[PDB]
Amino acid sequence: SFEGQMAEYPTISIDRFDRENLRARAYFLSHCDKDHMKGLRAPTLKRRLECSLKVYLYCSPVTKELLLTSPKYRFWKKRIISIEIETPTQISLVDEASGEKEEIVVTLLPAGHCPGSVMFLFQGNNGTVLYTGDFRLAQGEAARMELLHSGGRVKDIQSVYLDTTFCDPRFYQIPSREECLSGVLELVRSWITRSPYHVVWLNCKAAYGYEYLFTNLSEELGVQVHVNKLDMFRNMPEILHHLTTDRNTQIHACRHPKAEEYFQWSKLPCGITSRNRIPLHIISIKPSTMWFGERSRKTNVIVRTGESSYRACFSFHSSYSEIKDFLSYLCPVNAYPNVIPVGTTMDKVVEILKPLCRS
Ligand SMILES: [Zn+2]
């Protein structure tokens, strides 16, 4: 998968903070979530930050704000530097022992509709490289990123380190973000407008990136979404105001204690079953990735699984056709998969991408 270091600039570590990454001259975090924060508050990292004073963590403004709300990452406060989006920024990397000073320019590019998530474009004296993090771009979106271009052509990119979650031809097409949103919106609307006692449970994983779903549902329907915790958004009113910790609402995205089995659940996580002793009429909607082959047509983003249960198309990651389009456009020398899909291996994904690369 991806273990923190790009071959071209080994002294920087991205989205991985353990093992070899303990010797980084600079750290980068693409987005706030467990999978991309492995080792980020390990005692061995803290130990190393005490011995190495000029090492910083770089991320988007939103990611910095999110991280500083958590007591367990406050030790980073003095050492976290945000970089504005699409604002090429020079960073100095110093060898703590010797006197090797190394200069790189980093540009943050949007990755997809998820709070604070970015791609990092690095330009230095060993070529240009792109680290995508998790991403899903809109149609034609990469082509519109002026900072990926020079002289009306794409920049010469040596290596792209990219989200290959669905890098297999079986995952050829995934419904668009807009298609996914509209499907969920209209399902929720059809339910909660029936009476004040009709409520929806959005069954989401313990991860950021459902916020755009929550905010659009809230905006369109004039209802706040129930969540377990919203204090990470204390300084983000455009998100915060669409959310609530009060369970007296028609849209819920609360979560059971993570320990519990899916088969143990029999209600809303927060325990509300009635209002004015009138039973709530509840449907469950589970965001779930759905896809279609190259030669198939897309079908409904809403899949009914029971009298009161539904799956809804939703993806954090680009489809295979979107990956191909992105890499075809960027035309790098090398493409490195960051994720091996569960039904394959790392070497075989590298081979699927080889025809899009120059060498
Ligand atoms: Zn709830």
Author numbering: 3 to 361
From the paper:
Artemis (SNM1C/DCLRE1C) is an endonuclease that plays a key role in development of B- and T-lymphocytes and in dsDNA break repair by non-homologous end-joining (NHEJ). Artemis is phosphorylated by DNA-PKcs and acts to open DNA hairpin intermediates generated during V(D)J and class-switch recombination. Artemis belongs to a superfamily of nucleases containing metallo-β-lactamase (MBL) and β-CASP (CPSF-Artemis-SNM1-Pso2) domains. The overall fold of the catalytic core of Artemis is similar to that of SNM1A and SNM1B (2 Å backbone RMSD); it has all the key structural characteristics of human MBL fold nucleases, with the di-metal containing active site at the interface between the MBL and β-CASP domains.
We solved structures of three Artemis variants D37A, H33A and an Omenn syndrome patient mutation, H35D. We crystallized three forms of truncated Artemis (aa 1–361) with substitutions in several of these metal ion co-ordinating residues, i.e. D37A, H33A, and the Omenn Syndrome patient mutation H35D. The overall architecture of the three variants is almost identical to WT Artemis. The D37A structure crystallizes with only one nickel ion (M1); Both the H33A and H35D variants exhibited loss of the M1 ion. By contrast, all three variants retained the Zn ion in the zinc finger-like motif of the β-CASP domain. Histidines 33 and 35 are the first two histidine residues in the HxHxDH motif (M1 binding) in the active site. In the absence of active site metal ions, the loop comprising residues 113–119 moves away from the active site and a small rearrangement occurs in α8 (residues 348–358). In both the H33A and H35D variants, α8 moves slightly closer towards β14, compared to the WT and D37A variant. In H33A and H35D variants, both β-strand E and α-helix E shifted upward and away from the zinc finger like motif. Differential scanning fluorimetry (DSF) analyses showed that both H33A and H35D variants are substantially destabilized with ΔTm around -13°C compared to WT Artemis. Our D37A, H33A, and H35D variants lost the ability to digest DNA substrate in vitro, in accord with results with full-length variants.
